[PDB]
Symmetry: D2
Subunit: 481 residues, 4 copies
Amino acid sequence: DTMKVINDPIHGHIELHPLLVRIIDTPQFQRLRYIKQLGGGYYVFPGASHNRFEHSLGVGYLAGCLVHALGEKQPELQISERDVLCVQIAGLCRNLGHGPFSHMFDGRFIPLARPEVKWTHEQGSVMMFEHLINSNGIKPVMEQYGLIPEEDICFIKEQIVGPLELWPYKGRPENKSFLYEIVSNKRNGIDVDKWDYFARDCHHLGIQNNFDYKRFIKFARVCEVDNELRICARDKEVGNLYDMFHTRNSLHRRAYQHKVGNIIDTMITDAFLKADDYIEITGAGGKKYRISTAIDDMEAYTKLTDNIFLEILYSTDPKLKDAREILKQIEYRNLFKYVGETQPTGQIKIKREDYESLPKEVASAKPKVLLDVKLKAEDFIVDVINMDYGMQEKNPIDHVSFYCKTAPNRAIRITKNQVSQLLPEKFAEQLIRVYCKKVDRKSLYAARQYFVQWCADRNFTKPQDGDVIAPLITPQKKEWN
Amino acid sequence: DTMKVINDPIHGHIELHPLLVRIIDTPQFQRLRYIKQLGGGYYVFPGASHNRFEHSLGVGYLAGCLVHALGEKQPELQISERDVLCVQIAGLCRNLGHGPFSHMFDGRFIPLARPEVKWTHEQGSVMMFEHLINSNGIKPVMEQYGLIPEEDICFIKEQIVGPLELWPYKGRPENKSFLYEIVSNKRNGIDVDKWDYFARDCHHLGIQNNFDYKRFIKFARVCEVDNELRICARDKEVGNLYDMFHTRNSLHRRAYQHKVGNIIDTMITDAFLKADDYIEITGAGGKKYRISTAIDDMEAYTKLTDNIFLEILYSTDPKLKDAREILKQIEYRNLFKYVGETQPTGQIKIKREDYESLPKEVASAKPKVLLDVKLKAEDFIVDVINMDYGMQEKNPIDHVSFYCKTAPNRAIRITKNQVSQLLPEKFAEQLIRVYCKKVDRKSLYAARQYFVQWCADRNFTKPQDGDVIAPLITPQKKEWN
Amino acid sequence: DTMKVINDPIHGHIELHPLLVRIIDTPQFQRLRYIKQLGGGYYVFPGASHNRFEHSLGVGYLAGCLVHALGEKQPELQISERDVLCVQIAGLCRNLGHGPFSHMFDGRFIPLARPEVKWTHEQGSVMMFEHLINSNGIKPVMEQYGLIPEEDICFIKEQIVGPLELWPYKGRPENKSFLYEIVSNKRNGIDVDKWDYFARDCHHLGIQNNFDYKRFIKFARVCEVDNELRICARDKEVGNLYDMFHTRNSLHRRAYQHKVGNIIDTMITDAFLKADDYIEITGAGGKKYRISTAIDDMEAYTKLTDNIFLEILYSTDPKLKDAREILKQIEYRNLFKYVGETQPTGQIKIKREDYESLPKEVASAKPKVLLDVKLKAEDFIVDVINMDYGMQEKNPIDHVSFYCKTAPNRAIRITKNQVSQLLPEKFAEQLIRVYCKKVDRKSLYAARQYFVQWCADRNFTKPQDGDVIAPLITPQKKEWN
Amino acid sequence: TMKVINDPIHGHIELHPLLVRIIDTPQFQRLRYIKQLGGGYYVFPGASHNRFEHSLGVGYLAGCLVHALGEKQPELQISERDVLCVQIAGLCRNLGHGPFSHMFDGRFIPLARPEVKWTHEQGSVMMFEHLINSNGIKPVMEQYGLIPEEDICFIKEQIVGPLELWPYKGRPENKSFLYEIVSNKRNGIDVDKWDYFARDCHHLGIQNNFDYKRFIKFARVCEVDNELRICARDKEVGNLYDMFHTRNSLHRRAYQHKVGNIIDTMITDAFLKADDYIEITGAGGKKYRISTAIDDMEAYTKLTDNIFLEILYSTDPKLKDAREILKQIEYRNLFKYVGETQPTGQIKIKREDYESLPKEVASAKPKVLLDVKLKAEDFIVDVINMDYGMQEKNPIDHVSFYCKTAPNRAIRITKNQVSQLLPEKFAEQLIRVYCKKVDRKSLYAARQYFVQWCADRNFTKPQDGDVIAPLITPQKKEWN
Ligand SMILES: Nc1nc2c(ncn2[C@H]2C[C@H](O)[C@@H](COP(=O)(O)OP(=O)(O)OP(=O)(O)O)O2)c(=O)[nH]1
Ligand SMILES: Nc1nc2c(ncn2[C@H]2C[C@H](O)[C@@H](COP(=O)(O)OP(=O)(O)OP(=O)(O)O)O2)c(=O)[nH]1
Ligand SMILES: Nc1nc2c(ncn2[C@H]2C[C@H](O)[C@@H](COP(=O)(O)OP(=O)(O)OP(=O)(O)O)O2)c(=O)[nH]1
Ligand SMILES: Nc1nc2c(ncn2[C@H]2C[C@H](O)[C@@H](COP(=O)(O)OP(=O)(O)OP(=O)(O)O)O2)c(=O)[nH]1
Ligand SMILES: [Mg+2]
């Protein structure tokens, strides 16, 4: 058995070591071909047909690239082929945990269907990885290629999800700390996963990516930082680093958080919730699971893909009527109507426990206008979106180590004032989108009045179209004028 | 209802008239989101995740582009916006008839399941279009936008499939003849459908497209050709036109006819054949249809997509075991092994009615070599592939009209000798690919011996790896030496 | 006589009306083939070989595109073919005024050699366009294609430079105000010139551009804003607008203001200053001019291009030795050394009249470090760069009007807080770069010491490599530690 | 230390300090002032790229190929010395080009000095020697582990071939494959082509079909005839044919563009009219001409596209006629394209007869009334040999292949084993005819003469034959 070459639109010709090939050629990995990277985004950006599978290949490739470059520049790090293979495997497998329509599953469906559990795609990925190894006798192949399965499986899982619970890692010692910054960077979020999705998502969406991962790779080194060996970027790349996150933000504003994409995710979630009692997924020992419980059995989860959508759409079962209908409404493009967007002012933040209270608040608004219809709380959808640089309120560049030309081995820090006064003063904010489930002109008008009045009452920002959609409300709010 | 703008990775921002929007937002059209453009190609080129849907959008867009250019350069053709809309609709809808995994369904599955029928994706597109129209109340929307449904529906269908059986079309008369050359060009095959798939497939496969359709559009006029107003190209462009077909050939060589992608379409077709007795698809009136018979009822065929693959894969029904296993072997990458490629010589033309006899012939070869194992007819797959410029043995450029800069309204002919002595001297050929279903090393060596001796016997071309896989057989053939 | 097609790597096939071709095929215009768009940038980014000529073609093309789109969507604006042609000509001709190495000439050389005249590339463009018209018999051609030369040349000039001095323009009445917002937008800087240079400079530099001008064009309309018709953008696009300027800033940071690119422009400028007494340029009537005086005779300025560089480089004249010498140092890559970059803190700005005193300040600093070399003012270069969004301190998005989907003829304003809290809080800043004209190690060490001490003394920002290049200076400053 | 350079084609290119020392000389930086495609820029405005960036690209790709080969096959004993030398060879194999590139070696020199056998290869060797010697590079070379005598020999050999049974002195037979990288004398598959495909395509605004990276990945070193040579994987054969196809296409669309060619022609004419008056100072303060600067590398260093502008900006009467020609180019008053034909049959047009062809066209007798008479002096006849780089040969016949079942074993693949749709021939000629008289009467007349001349010699029927000469084509029964 030998290496295989794969041609990828983003990276060109990727070499895949036989062990990696063995891992890829499993039902657990091949499953990723049937899950859309951007989920509902595909129904807004037609080019976004790409799946988690090709992305996974890309991430494995890039992890390989960065670890190899680091090894070639700095022999003294003692990076082994075993290290390279473990980092490649981690990169390759860090998307195994995703569910139907990707972020629709972990971001919307699971939190609603199973609020008592704290599910993440990372946990899902380690579980699916374990299932993959155990179902396909991978351990002897790992040993055959020089790996030490106990240590190395620990290492890979640690790369994916973090310490499994003072150096908290068992897979590798502190002198290899930098290896943990490659596939999933918990320290500052700068990892190859982002690079691949920037390039790939851009390629498919019809948006241009402005981040140069190659340049970053060429200017990266390993330096000592607080008794670990960590990845450091050349000082003059700091601007580019800020720009990387800017790029991420932009991709979220244009595509990932598109109003219509989000509402389509929401409707699919509604359909899944209404179908959860009736769809059966047959897992280990012939036991039967729901969509909401497939996460409890990896054999079942292996069979849980975008297919579900179609299974609901093509169904005849009367019990599934209500689910089916919603999906049908998606096909006819009879979607919930976007009412508007606003933001909190002051220091005010909206917390997850208070999400449920928002539709009620909106309907309880009393706009001083002639209305024809009256709207209820259940007619309203309030979608709140946390936009940040990946570390909540923190500036992630404050967690980046740099090096200078004249002392390549000395790590330094760079503050925001040292770069540009035109950079963000803040690194997190919330966007509030309001939609209406009633799609008639009268109802839409009413919902617009309710929404603007609500915005005024809570001292939120004036909606961009406010004077147009509610010319009777906005002048009452002096804070807007 | 206003026009909508859609962002496409290939074409950028596409404007869609409200009528086209109404047509697109139906189950019949949205169905195409669930059928891979290149089918099994995705399992070889991971970037090739694109579906028939977005391709259809691109075809409609380019149809619009070309008819608009023709109109704006020559107002004397009296091209109406009704004509523009009908050409756009035809462009949009000429992929509606495709089935699961695209060509796998009409090039392999249907011919083997229903050999009595003569089914084409064109006819399917016609039927599905009629179904879409009737099921969605489109006729009065058409009327709302100035269309005359009888004549215009006729025109659209004629653009898709040709004369519905002197001037043979009922939709438009001779003075609009050129309109029939835009969406599906039966005259020489130069149409916008090709242009979109060149660009799109290249974008996803990771091959670069060297054909410039924008340039062709720029240089296109319409001149008089035997009392017909036909589309003519600028003389200068003849080389490019030749290369257009060359490009097609290359794309077929590199991707569409890739040995493994083809063997994978073959395995999926086998599994569809074995699942054939047991999968049910609900058609009109609850009547149970069928993978091989869903084509008889459009309401059912609307539900026939790539999902079938998954339905088989995820099944637990014992009757389906046989199909299931096959799909599973695709996931484990246990495919039929490629043995080789050869070509006929001289005047030999392998006919359709001999394909079935082919595996027996290889199996019945006597190579004068020691074999640990002998193999049977069953063990063999012989795939015959007809590569051509789209008009059998004919030069399609001989069916193209050109114009000269000094007299733009005067159509002329250009012959191959007026172009280059480096052009093809043939415009059709046959490729013979052989695989063995027995994948062990011993069996494969055997298969290679059998195969080469078969090539020497039928006086086919020597396989490229002939002197390495069968060294005790190649010195028998003097033509090969 | 007839239109021509030109194939451009950015825009593809560009159609040029015969009048435009007439204008283009003159010495005054073809001159632009011999002036690098990015000047000294080519000596850092080898792909940036592009000249002002191709950029001019692109700008004319885009101006045409925007005016055409506006006319097509809004026939009630009464945009004539004459308007379209005049906008195209202004677009084609707004780069005529550039001198050798573009921004090196108008940004560095002229301010030093002719500080009494207030020269701009705009004014130079007007003069050169006048010279083009008058030297090439263009007026009768204009008349031949339906233009009225007094009015229309006035219009074109006004598009290039602004009012030649209520409605201040004389080329077109108030109802055509929007037409002045296309080629050079003095209201907010959003124009087609930027769009072309974004795409082109990116294509050649090897940086991907983030901005989608086609999308902008699709979402642009004309609306009435305070008794004026202006180009308005869809509200939804506000984000992208901010990002446009972000892009500009980034392009300036990565490429246009690259420290080395700038130092090479500076050295070329020095050479030109040292060559000015001895270079002769034959102007009107055999009359001779200097590099510094070529601008007061258009006939001489026509022959003033990048060629000068080579003329100096290949000279044998003893009197040119020194100038030649400098150019030679550029070839051996013996450049002035970059010492560092810093910024003022808080609110303080560096006034222009103070620039000249800066190198003396650096040389006057007293770093507590033992040095063998003492440097003087003449050895220091202090380059002050104003980075902004094109309107000094003002947010240009505050000078954009938008429209909403439900009332697209109604113009509205959108404020920064209505968009995002992550946007810039300021729109102007200054970067101070310091170089040393002595290039030996010891001189560079000293220069670094003086520079960091100077930064501390003026309470400027701590340089990014401060602790590395000057470990004995930086701990003195508590604000830095 | 190393330097990184960002290139739009290859992205970030790392440059070893020795390469940097070589690049930062007047002899190398010279290439910034010579257009890759010359007159092509006056037709494809995106084609502003110069030989400098192309050279960087070639050096980079040479490095890539050698590194890949080494890493896949350690048994080859490819040293860092070998890598650096192959890189230098890649970087420096364009040093010999003159003003407007091929215009200078394809057109000017053959007319200015018809006795010399000038090639850009030899010029590259001479210029490389001049660079090394003028910039104290040999000590730097030994400073980075190279042995100047052997290695400079090796580099020159990579550039021009055997300087004077294994003909090479720079490296023995077990390193033969190294000579197949920068300039492949054997089959023309080299990294120089790869770079110009991608770069020229990027600037022209036409897309590249060929995937060099794939080739690099499916490339090996296998033993052939006591030589270790680069072999491609069998399945790549189609692609290889396509490579040459792409080349042909690029010549068809861009490099041999009728107007591009006529502009190179006009510039050549202007340089010829300027030759006696343009002084270029060389070694010793000696003065040279455009035509003789190739005899002194110091003067040649200063011979770039700038000549054009020096002629265009001149005032002296002696240069007027040169100057005027350039001015016509600016006014787009170009010589007029009359038409194109090809010779039929196995027959070919020898370079010996090229000078006679303009007389022939003016000697034709079209049976039509013509206002004007044209002289041989009024016609330009430009003949262009289109081929796969080995005259009449099929370069794929000179490629070695390997199969995945035994990848250390060279094999051959014939055209018949591949496809019936491939070219049946691998060389042909194109004849373009122009008229220096641009008035309408003259152009009509020229079209008559030309079509009649095509008829008289049984040349191929011009595509617009019926349109431009309707009275002429009927006599030729074969044209219908
Ligand atoms: N750019 C490009 N990619 C290709 C071409 N042919 C195949 N590919 C892609 C498809 C795959 O993702 C990858 C590998 O395909 P290959 O045909 O080279 O390997 P394959 O396993 O099919 O054959 P093999 O086992 O080596 O005999 O490259 C080609 O001619 N050009
Ligand atoms: N290139 C690009 N495409 C975008 C951007 N935002 C959305 N798109 C894509 C998605 C769609 O394919 C197409 C239209 O999206 P829009 O957001 O402009 O239309 P939408 O119906 O959502 O809003 P609307 O009804 O007009 O208020 O453009 C963007 O910022 N850049
Ligand atoms: N993409 C592409 N561009 C081409 C091709 N041939 C020429 N071009 C470029 C060069 C020019 O910028 C532009 C126009 O060149 P043309 O050859 O079509 O016009 P030309 O004046 O030479 O011929 P004409 O006067 O129309 O008989 O297109 C081609 O085959 N493909
Ligand atoms: N893609 C990209 N290229 C850049 C950027 N900045 C500069 N370049 C290009 C210009 C050069 O061709 C190449 C190297 O420039 P650098 O600024 O990295 O090196 P430089 O010598 O100026 O600084 P140094 O001596 O290392 O401190 O990269 C950037 O932000 N992005
Ligand atoms: Mg401006």
